[PDB]
Amino acid sequence: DQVQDMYYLSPMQEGMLFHAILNPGQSFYLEQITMKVKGSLNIKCLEESMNVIMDRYDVFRTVFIHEKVKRPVQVVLKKRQFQIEEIDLTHLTGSEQTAKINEYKEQDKIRGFDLTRDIPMRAAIFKKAEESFEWVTSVHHIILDGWCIGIVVQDLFKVYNALREQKPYSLPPVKPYKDYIKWLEKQDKQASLRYWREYLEDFEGQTTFAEQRKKQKDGYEPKELLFSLPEAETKAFTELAKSQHTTLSTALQAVWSVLISRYQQSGDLAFGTVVSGRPAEIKGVEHMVGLFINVVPRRVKLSEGITFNDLLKQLQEQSLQSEPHQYVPLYDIQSQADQPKLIDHIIVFENYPLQDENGFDMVDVHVFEKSNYDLNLMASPGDEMLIKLAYNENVFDEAFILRLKSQLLTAIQQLIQNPDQPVSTINI
């Protein structure tokens, strides 16, 4: 009587559940969002607003069963009451407060979620002063990928603002995540594996930036280099992508391909790309909340004389052909190449980052996610395109990451100016 529905997991959900169970305490698939709040936040109203969201999106009411079943299932419960943990730190010094919040975050990363019982999202709000809070939200990506949180946040603050202004509100209908599970039933899984097998046919593997990789200190030492593409170049880069009927994300991947081709002295190269995973065939798939995005390999072939606009065309065409097959987990993709480390770095172009009316201001919005690659090129749109190189400094020197920034900037400039010359003529 408490169960609304039950259905199988997507292949990607199944993979996450498998590794989540096998690796407790390691922060797998956990996203931690920290918002510093200055103003008259009403936590009771925020909690009421979040419970409307719980009712709206089935994934928040979902738990998972793996024991004593032939195959894992996800169970949608009819009603789950969400509670924000309120913690009063107003009796502590600023130093004591920061230590308490860091303590919470580190224990929360280790705690993770019991996916057979917990709501796979939690929130704690720390009161530091009268109108001063820190809001830490944790979520598991088996119910909600990182590009979905903006959808939920928009709904959350529409409801909050309506209750604050004491006026009626509505939210538009949304299709249930089960509709995506139903679409997966109609897909030929062996045909999708064959797509990836043929795409990666005869690829010889690649250690990216092999001559720059250190092998000394143990573990991951996370560092980042942030920089912006100047406005004039950003405008021209955007106009170029549009004029070739492609996206900024594809254009950035094309620039990176040129850079990698030089370091690898090769015209056959690969890197990971985060793809949307939302099949256009599915009605209103744009507005669904759940797990969709995936890291898939991009394999780029640079022939003699190939131009930037040629590359844009190559990549844009492959994006379209890959769309029906983006649900295949990378483990299964890379098994079709007999190459467990086919890719070793990724490009992530996030159109609406969380980092980038309510009675309060949000400041220093920060997102934590476990890093799985020693190098990550991350970009987001803006008047100046935002670019971040997030890397493992135990593997790559800061000076090398600074060189990559320099080369990326001059490559973008040169490719904008001569998109119809061979990319081999660019100087890096």
CSV table of C-alpha atoms in Angstrom, one decimal:
chain,number,residue,atom,x,y,z
A,1,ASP,CA,0.0,0.0,0.0
A,2,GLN,CA,3.0,2.3,0.4
A,3,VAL,CA,4.4,1.3,-3.0
A,4,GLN,CA,3.3,3.3,-6.1
A,5,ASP,CA,5.3,1.4,-8.7
A,6,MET,CA,8.2,-0.9,-9.4
A,7,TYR,CA,10.4,-1.2,-12.5
A,8,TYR,CA,13.8,-2.3,-13.6
A,9,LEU,CA,16.9,-0.2,-13.6
A,10,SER,CA,18.5,1.4,-16.6
A,11,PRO,CA,21.9,-0.2,-17.5
A,12,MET,CA,23.6,2.8,-16.1
A,13,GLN,CA,21.6,2.7,-12.9
A,14,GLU,CA,22.4,-1.0,-12.6
A,15,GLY,CA,26.1,-0.2,-12.9
A,16,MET,CA,25.9,2.5,-10.2
A,17,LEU,CA,24.0,0.2,-7.8
A,18,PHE,CA,26.6,-2.5,-8.4
A,19,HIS,CA,29.6,-0.4,-7.6
A,20,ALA,CA,27.8,1.6,-4.8
A,21,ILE,CA,27.1,-1.7,-2.9
A,22,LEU,CA,30.6,-3.0,-3.5
A,23,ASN,CA,32.4,0.2,-2.4
A,24,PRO,CA,30.8,1.8,0.6
A,25,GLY,CA,32.3,4.9,2.2
A,26,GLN,CA,34.2,6.1,-1.0
A,27,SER,CA,31.9,8.9,-2.1
A,28,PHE,CA,31.0,7.2,-5.4
A,29,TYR,CA,28.2,8.9,-7.3
A,30,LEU,CA,27.7,11.5,-4.6
A,31,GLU,CA,27.3,15.2,-5.4
A,32,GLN,CA,27.7,17.7,-2.5
A,33,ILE,CA,26.4,21.2,-3.1
A,34,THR,CA,27.2,24.0,-0.6
A,35,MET,CA,25.3,27.3,-0.7
A,36,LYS,CA,26.3,30.2,1.6
A,37,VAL,CA,23.1,32.1,2.3
A,38,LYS,CA,22.9,35.7,3.5
A,39,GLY,CA,19.4,37.0,4.2
A,40,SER,CA,16.0,36.0,5.7
A,41,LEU,CA,15.9,32.4,4.7
A,42,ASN,CA,12.8,30.6,6.0
A,43,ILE,CA,13.9,27.0,6.6
A,44,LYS,CA,10.4,25.8,7.4
A,45,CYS,CA,9.1,27.2,4.1
A,46,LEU,CA,12.1,25.7,2.3
A,47,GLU,CA,11.2,22.3,3.8
A,48,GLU,CA,7.6,22.6,2.8
A,49,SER,CA,8.8,23.6,-0.7
A,50,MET,CA,11.1,20.6,-0.9
A,51,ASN,CA,8.3,18.2,0.0
A,52,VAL,CA,6.2,19.5,-2.9
A,53,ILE,CA,9.2,18.6,-5.1
A,54,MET,CA,9.3,15.1,-3.5
A,55,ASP,CA,5.8,14.6,-4.6
A,56,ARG,CA,6.5,16.0,-8.1
A,57,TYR,CA,9.4,13.8,-9.2
A,58,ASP,CA,9.2,10.0,-8.6
A,59,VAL,CA,12.9,9.5,-8.4
A,60,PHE,CA,13.1,11.2,-5.0
A,61,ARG,CA,10.6,8.6,-3.6
A,62,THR,CA,12.6,5.7,-5.1
A,63,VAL,CA,14.5,3.0,-3.3
A,64,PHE,CA,16.4,0.1,-4.7
A,65,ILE,CA,16.2,-3.7,-4.1
A,66,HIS,CA,19.1,-6.0,-5.0
A,67,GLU,CA,18.8,-8.8,-2.5
A,68,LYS,CA,16.6,-11.9,-3.0
A,69,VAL,CA,15.6,-10.8,-6.4
A,70,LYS,CA,16.5,-12.2,-9.8
A,71,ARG,CA,17.4,-8.7,-11.0
A,72,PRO,CA,17.6,-5.3,-9.2
A,73,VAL,CA,14.4,-3.3,-9.1
A,74,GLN,CA,13.6,0.3,-8.2
A,75,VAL,CA,10.5,0.9,-6.1
A,76,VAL,CA,8.6,4.2,-6.1
A,77,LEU,CA,7.0,4.9,-2.7
A,78,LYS,CA,3.8,6.9,-2.7
A,79,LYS,CA,4.9,9.4,-0.1
A,80,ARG,CA,8.2,10.3,1.6
A,81,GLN,CA,8.5,13.1,4.1
A,82,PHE,CA,11.7,15.1,3.7
A,83,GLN,CA,13.3,16.9,6.6
A,84,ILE,CA,16.1,19.4,6.6
A,85,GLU,CA,18.6,19.0,9.4
A,86,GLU,CA,18.9,22.3,11.2
A,87,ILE,CA,22.1,23.0,13.2
A,88,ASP,CA,22.6,26.1,15.3
A,89,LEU,CA,26.3,27.3,15.3
A,90,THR,CA,25.6,30.8,16.6
A,91,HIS,CA,27.4,30.0,19.9
A,92,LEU,CA,30.7,29.3,18.0
A,93,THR,CA,33.5,31.4,16.8
A,94,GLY,CA,33.9,31.7,13.0
A,95,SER,CA,36.8,29.3,13.2
A,96,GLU,CA,34.8,26.8,15.2
A,97,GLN,CA,31.9,27.1,12.7
A,98,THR,CA,34.1,26.4,9.7
A,99,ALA,CA,35.5,23.3,11.5
A,100,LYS,CA,32.0,22.0,12.3
A,101,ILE,CA,30.8,22.4,8.7
A,102,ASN,CA,33.9,20.8,7.3
A,103,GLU,CA,33.4,17.9,9.8
A,104,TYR,CA,29.9,17.5,8.6
A,105,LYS,CA,30.9,17.5,4.9
A,106,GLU,CA,33.6,14.9,5.3
A,107,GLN,CA,31.4,12.6,7.4
A,108,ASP,CA,28.6,13.0,4.8
A,109,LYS,CA,30.9,12.0,2.0
A,110,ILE,CA,31.8,8.8,3.8
A,111,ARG,CA,28.2,8.1,5.0
A,112,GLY,CA,26.8,8.3,1.5
A,113,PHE,CA,23.3,6.7,1.2
A,114,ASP,CA,21.8,3.3,1.9
A,115,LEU,CA,20.0,3.0,-1.4
A,116,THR,CA,17.7,0.3,-0.1
A,117,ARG,CA,16.1,2.7,2.5
A,118,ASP,CA,17.2,6.3,2.4
A,119,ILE,CA,15.8,9.2,0.4
A,120,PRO,CA,18.9,9.5,-1.8
A,121,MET,CA,19.1,13.2,-1.1
A,122,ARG,CA,19.7,15.1,2.2
A,123,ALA,CA,20.1,18.7,3.3
A,124,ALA,CA,21.6,20.3,6.4
A,125,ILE,CA,21.4,24.0,7.0
A,126,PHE,CA,23.8,25.5,9.6
A,127,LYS,CA,22.8,28.8,11.3
A,128,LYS,CA,26.0,30.9,11.8
A,129,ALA,CA,24.4,34.2,12.6
A,130,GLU,CA,21.0,35.9,12.5
A,131,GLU,CA,20.7,36.1,8.7
A,132,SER,CA,23.7,33.9,7.9
A,133,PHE,CA,23.5,30.2,6.9
A,134,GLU,CA,25.4,27.5,5.1
A,135,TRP,CA,23.3,25.0,3.2
A,136,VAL,CA,24.8,21.6,2.3
A,137,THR,CA,22.9,19.3,0.0
A,138,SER,CA,24.0,15.8,-0.8
A,139,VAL,CA,22.5,13.7,-3.6
A,140,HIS,CA,23.2,10.3,-5.2
A,141,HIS,CA,23.3,10.3,-9.0
A,142,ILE,CA,21.4,7.0,-9.3
A,143,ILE,CA,18.2,9.1,-9.0
A,144,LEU,CA,19.4,12.5,-10.3
A,145,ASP,CA,22.3,13.4,-12.5
A,146,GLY,CA,24.3,16.6,-12.1
A,147,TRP,CA,22.6,18.4,-15.1
A,148,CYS,CA,19.2,17.8,-13.5
A,149,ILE,CA,19.6,19.7,-10.3
A,150,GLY,CA,18.9,23.0,-11.9
A,151,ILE,CA,15.4,21.8,-13.0
A,152,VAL,CA,14.6,20.8,-9.5
A,153,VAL,CA,16.1,24.0,-8.0
A,154,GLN,CA,14.0,26.2,-10.3
A,155,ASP,CA,10.8,24.4,-9.2
A,156,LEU,CA,12.0,24.5,-5.6
A,157,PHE,CA,12.3,28.3,-5.6
A,158,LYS,CA,9.1,28.9,-7.6
A,159,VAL,CA,7.2,27.1,-4.8
A,160,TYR,CA,9.2,28.9,-2.1
A,161,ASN,CA,8.7,32.3,-3.7
A,162,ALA,CA,4.9,31.6,-4.1
A,163,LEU,CA,4.5,30.7,-0.4
A,164,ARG,CA,6.6,33.7,0.5
A,165,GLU,CA,4.5,36.1,-1.6
A,166,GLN,CA,1.4,34.2,-0.5
A,167,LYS,CA,0.0,33.7,-4.0
A,168,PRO,CA,-1.3,30.7,-5.9
A,169,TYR,CA,1.1,28.7,-8.1
A,170,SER,CA,1.2,25.9,-10.6
A,171,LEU,CA,3.9,23.7,-12.2
A,172,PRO,CA,3.6,22.3,-15.7
A,173,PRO,CA,3.0,18.5,-16.1
A,174,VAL,CA,6.2,16.4,-16.4
A,175,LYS,CA,6.6,12.9,-17.8
A,176,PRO,CA,7.7,10.2,-15.3
A,177,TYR,CA,11.2,8.7,-15.4
A,178,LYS,CA,9.5,5.3,-16.0
A,179,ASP,CA,8.8,6.6,-19.5
A,180,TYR,CA,12.6,6.5,-20.1
A,181,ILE,CA,12.8,3.0,-18.7
A,182,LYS,CA,10.0,2.0,-21.1
A,183,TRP,CA,12.0,3.5,-24.0
A,184,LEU,CA,15.0,1.4,-23.1
A,185,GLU,CA,12.9,-1.7,-23.4
A,186,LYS,CA,12.4,-0.9,-27.1
A,187,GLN,CA,16.1,-0.6,-27.8
A,188,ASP,CA,18.1,-3.4,-29.4
A,189,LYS,CA,21.0,-3.8,-26.9
A,190,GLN,CA,23.2,-5.8,-29.2
A,191,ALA,CA,22.8,-3.3,-32.0
A,192,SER,CA,23.9,-0.6,-29.6
A,193,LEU,CA,27.0,-2.6,-28.6
A,194,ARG,CA,27.7,-3.2,-32.3
A,195,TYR,CA,27.5,0.6,-32.9
A,196,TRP,CA,30.3,1.2,-30.3
A,197,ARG,CA,32.3,-1.8,-31.5
A,198,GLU,CA,32.4,-0.5,-35.0
A,199,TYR,CA,33.0,3.0,-33.9
A,200,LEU,CA,36.1,1.9,-32.0
A,201,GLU,CA,37.2,-0.7,-34.5
A,202,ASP,CA,41.0,-0.9,-34.6
A,203,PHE,CA,41.6,1.9,-32.2
A,204,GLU,CA,45.1,1.4,-30.8
A,205,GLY,CA,44.9,3.0,-27.4
A,206,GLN,CA,46.4,6.2,-26.0
A,207,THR,CA,48.1,7.5,-22.8
A,208,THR,CA,47.4,11.2,-23.1
A,209,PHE,CA,50.3,13.5,-22.4
A,210,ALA,CA,52.4,10.5,-21.6
A,211,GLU,CA,55.7,12.5,-21.5
A,212,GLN,CA,54.1,14.9,-18.9
A,213,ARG,CA,52.7,12.3,-16.5
A,214,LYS,CA,54.4,12.1,-13.1
A,215,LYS,CA,54.6,8.8,-11.2
A,216,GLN,CA,55.8,9.7,-7.8
A,217,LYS,CA,53.3,10.7,-5.1
A,218,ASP,CA,50.4,8.4,-4.4
A,219,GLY,CA,46.8,9.2,-4.8
A,220,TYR,CA,44.7,12.1,-6.2
A,221,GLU,CA,45.8,15.7,-5.3
A,222,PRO,CA,42.9,17.8,-6.8
A,223,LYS,CA,43.8,21.1,-8.3
A,224,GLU,CA,42.1,23.5,-10.7
A,225,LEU,CA,43.0,26.2,-13.1
A,226,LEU,CA,40.2,28.6,-14.0
A,227,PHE,CA,40.3,31.0,-16.9
A,228,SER,CA,38.0,32.8,-19.3
A,229,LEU,CA,37.9,33.2,-23.1
A,230,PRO,CA,37.8,37.0,-23.8
A,231,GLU,CA,34.4,38.3,-24.9
A,232,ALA,CA,35.5,39.1,-28.5
A,233,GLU,CA,36.8,35.6,-29.0
A,234,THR,CA,33.8,34.1,-27.2
A,235,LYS,CA,31.4,35.9,-29.6
A,236,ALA,CA,33.3,34.8,-32.6
A,237,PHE,CA,33.7,31.2,-31.4
A,238,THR,CA,29.9,31.1,-30.8
A,239,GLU,CA,29.1,32.6,-34.2
A,240,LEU,CA,31.4,30.1,-35.9
A,241,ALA,CA,29.8,27.1,-34.2
A,242,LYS,CA,26.3,28.4,-35.2
A,243,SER,CA,27.4,29.1,-38.8
A,244,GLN,CA,28.4,25.4,-39.1
A,245,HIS,CA,25.1,24.3,-37.5
A,246,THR,CA,26.8,22.8,-34.4
A,247,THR,CA,27.2,23.7,-30.7
A,248,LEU,CA,29.8,25.4,-28.6
A,249,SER,CA,30.4,22.0,-27.0
A,250,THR,CA,31.3,20.4,-30.3
A,251,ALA,CA,33.5,23.3,-31.2
A,252,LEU,CA,35.5,23.0,-28.0
A,253,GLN,CA,35.9,19.3,-28.5
A,254,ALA,CA,37.2,20.0,-32.0
A,255,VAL,CA,39.8,22.5,-30.7
A,256,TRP,CA,40.9,19.9,-28.1
A,257,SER,CA,41.2,17.3,-30.8
A,258,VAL,CA,43.7,19.5,-32.6
A,259,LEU,CA,45.8,19.9,-29.4
A,260,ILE,CA,45.7,16.2,-28.6
A,261,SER,CA,46.7,15.3,-32.2
A,262,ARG,CA,49.9,17.3,-31.8
A,263,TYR,CA,50.9,15.8,-28.4
A,264,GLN,CA,50.2,12.3,-29.5
A,265,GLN,CA,51.7,12.8,-33.0
A,266,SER,CA,48.6,10.9,-34.3
A,267,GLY,CA,45.5,11.5,-36.4
A,268,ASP,CA,43.5,8.9,-34.5
A,269,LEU,CA,42.7,9.9,-31.0
A,270,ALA,CA,40.1,9.6,-28.3
A,271,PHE,CA,38.8,11.4,-25.2
A,272,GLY,CA,35.6,11.1,-23.1
A,273,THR,CA,32.7,13.5,-23.5
A,274,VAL,CA,29.6,13.9,-21.3
A,275,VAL,CA,26.5,13.5,-23.4
A,276,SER,CA,22.9,14.4,-22.6
A,277,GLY,CA,21.5,10.9,-23.0
A,278,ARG,CA,18.0,12.3,-23.6
A,279,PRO,CA,16.3,10.6,-26.6
A,280,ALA,CA,14.5,13.1,-28.7
A,281,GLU,CA,11.9,10.5,-29.6
A,282,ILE,CA,10.6,10.6,-26.1
A,283,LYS,CA,7.9,13.2,-25.6
A,284,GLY,CA,8.9,16.0,-23.2
A,285,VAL,CA,12.2,14.2,-22.4
A,286,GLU,CA,13.7,17.7,-22.0
A,287,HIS,CA,11.9,18.2,-18.7
A,288,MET,CA,12.3,14.8,-17.1
A,289,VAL,CA,14.3,14.4,-13.8
A,290,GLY,CA,16.5,11.3,-13.4
A,291,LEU,CA,19.7,9.8,-14.5
A,292,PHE,CA,20.5,10.5,-18.2
A,293,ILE,CA,24.0,11.9,-18.8
A,294,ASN,CA,26.8,9.5,-19.6
A,295,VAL,CA,30.5,9.6,-20.4
A,296,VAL,CA,31.1,8.1,-23.8
A,297,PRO,CA,34.2,7.9,-26.0
A,298,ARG,CA,34.8,10.4,-28.7
A,299,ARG,CA,37.1,9.1,-31.4
A,300,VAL,CA,38.4,11.7,-33.8
A,301,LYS,CA,40.2,11.0,-37.1
A,302,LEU,CA,42.4,13.8,-38.6
A,303,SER,CA,43.2,13.2,-42.3
A,304,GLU,CA,45.9,15.2,-44.1
A,305,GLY,CA,44.5,18.7,-44.9
A,306,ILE,CA,41.5,18.4,-42.6
A,307,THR,CA,40.1,21.8,-41.6
A,308,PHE,CA,38.4,23.0,-38.5
A,309,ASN,CA,35.1,23.2,-40.3
A,310,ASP,CA,35.7,19.6,-41.6
A,311,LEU,CA,36.2,18.6,-37.9
A,312,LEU,CA,33.0,20.3,-36.8
A,313,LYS,CA,31.1,18.4,-39.5
A,314,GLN,CA,32.7,15.1,-38.5
A,315,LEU,CA,31.9,15.5,-34.8
A,316,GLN,CA,28.4,16.9,-35.3
A,317,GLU,CA,27.5,14.0,-37.6
A,318,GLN,CA,28.9,11.4,-35.1
A,319,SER,CA,27.0,13.1,-32.2
A,320,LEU,CA,23.7,12.5,-34.1
A,321,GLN,CA,24.5,8.9,-34.9
A,322,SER,CA,25.5,8.1,-31.3
A,323,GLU,CA,22.3,9.5,-29.8
A,324,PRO,CA,20.3,6.2,-29.7
A,325,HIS,CA,23.2,4.4,-28.0
A,326,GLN,CA,24.3,6.8,-25.3
A,327,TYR,CA,22.6,4.6,-22.6
A,328,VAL,CA,25.4,2.0,-22.8
A,329,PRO,CA,27.7,2.2,-19.8
A,330,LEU,CA,31.3,3.0,-20.5
A,331,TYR,CA,32.4,-0.3,-19.0
A,332,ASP,CA,30.4,-2.1,-21.6
A,333,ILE,CA,31.5,0.3,-24.4
A,334,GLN,CA,35.2,-0.3,-23.5
A,335,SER,CA,34.7,-4.0,-23.3
A,336,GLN,CA,33.6,-3.9,-27.0
A,337,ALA,CA,37.1,-2.5,-27.7
A,338,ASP,CA,39.0,-4.9,-25.3
A,339,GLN,CA,40.4,-1.7,-23.8
A,340,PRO,CA,39.6,-1.0,-20.1
A,341,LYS,CA,41.4,2.4,-20.2
A,342,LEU,CA,40.4,3.4,-23.7
A,343,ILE,CA,39.9,7.0,-22.5
A,344,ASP,CA,41.9,8.7,-19.7
A,345,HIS,CA,40.5,12.2,-19.6
A,346,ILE,CA,37.2,13.9,-20.4
A,347,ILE,CA,35.6,17.1,-21.7
A,348,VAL,CA,32.5,18.4,-19.9
A,349,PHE,CA,30.5,21.2,-21.4
A,350,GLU,CA,27.8,22.2,-18.9
A,351,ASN,CA,25.3,24.6,-20.3
A,352,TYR,CA,23.6,25.6,-17.0
A,353,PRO,CA,26.0,25.1,-14.1
A,354,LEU,CA,24.7,25.5,-10.6
A,355,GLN,CA,27.7,27.6,-9.6
A,356,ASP,CA,26.8,30.3,-12.1
A,357,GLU,CA,12.9,37.3,-5.2
A,358,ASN,CA,13.6,34.9,-2.4
A,359,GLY,CA,14.6,37.4,0.3
A,360,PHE,CA,18.2,36.0,0.5
A,361,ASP,CA,21.3,35.9,-1.6
A,362,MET,CA,23.2,32.7,-2.5
A,363,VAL,CA,27.0,33.1,-2.5
A,364,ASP,CA,30.0,30.8,-3.0
A,365,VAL,CA,27.8,28.0,-4.5
A,366,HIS,CA,30.3,25.1,-4.7
A,367,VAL,CA,29.9,21.6,-6.1
A,368,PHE,CA,31.9,18.6,-5.0
A,369,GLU,CA,32.1,15.4,-7.0
A,370,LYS,CA,34.7,12.6,-6.8
A,371,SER,CA,37.2,12.9,-9.6
A,372,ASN,CA,37.7,9.8,-11.8
A,373,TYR,CA,40.2,11.2,-14.4
A,374,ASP,CA,43.6,12.8,-13.9
A,375,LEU,CA,42.5,15.6,-16.3
A,376,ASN,CA,39.1,17.2,-17.0
A,377,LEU,CA,38.4,20.0,-19.4
A,378,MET,CA,35.3,21.8,-18.2
A,379,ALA,CA,33.5,24.7,-19.8
A,380,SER,CA,30.3,26.7,-19.5
A,381,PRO,CA,28.8,29.5,-21.5
A,382,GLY,CA,28.9,33.2,-20.7
A,383,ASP,CA,29.8,36.5,-22.2
A,384,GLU,CA,33.3,35.2,-21.6
A,385,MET,CA,33.3,31.4,-21.9
A,386,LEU,CA,34.4,29.9,-18.6
A,387,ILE,CA,37.0,27.2,-18.9
A,388,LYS,CA,38.4,25.0,-16.0
A,389,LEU,CA,41.2,22.5,-16.1
A,390,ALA,CA,40.6,20.2,-13.1
A,391,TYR,CA,43.5,17.8,-12.6
A,392,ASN,CA,45.5,15.5,-10.4
A,393,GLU,CA,48.6,17.4,-9.4
A,394,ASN,CA,50.3,14.2,-8.4
A,395,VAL,CA,50.3,13.4,-12.1
A,396,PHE,CA,50.4,16.8,-13.9
A,397,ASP,CA,52.5,19.8,-12.9
A,398,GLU,CA,50.8,23.1,-12.5
A,399,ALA,CA,53.2,24.5,-15.1
A,400,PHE,CA,52.0,22.0,-17.7
A,401,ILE,CA,48.3,22.9,-17.0
A,402,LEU,CA,49.3,26.5,-17.5
A,403,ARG,CA,50.9,25.6,-20.8
A,404,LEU,CA,47.6,23.9,-21.8
A,405,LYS,CA,45.7,27.0,-21.0
A,406,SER,CA,48.1,29.0,-23.2
A,407,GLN,CA,47.8,26.6,-26.1
A,408,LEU,CA,44.0,26.4,-25.8
A,409,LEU,CA,43.6,30.2,-26.0
A,410,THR,CA,45.9,30.6,-29.0
A,411,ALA,CA,44.4,27.6,-30.8
A,412,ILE,CA,40.9,29.0,-30.4
A,413,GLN,CA,42.0,32.4,-31.7
A,414,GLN,CA,43.8,30.8,-34.7
A,415,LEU,CA,41.0,28.4,-35.5
A,416,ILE,CA,38.4,31.2,-35.4
A,417,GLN,CA,40.4,33.2,-37.9
A,418,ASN,CA,41.1,30.3,-40.3
A,419,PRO,CA,38.5,27.6,-39.9
A,420,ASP,CA,39.0,26.6,-43.6
A,421,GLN,CA,42.7,26.0,-43.5
A,422,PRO,CA,44.3,22.7,-42.5
A,423,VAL,CA,44.4,22.5,-38.7
A,424,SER,CA,48.0,21.3,-39.1
A,425,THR,CA,48.9,25.0,-39.8
A,426,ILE,CA,47.9,26.1,-36.3
A,427,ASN,CA,50.9,27.0,-34.0
A,428,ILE,CA,50.9,25.8,-30.4
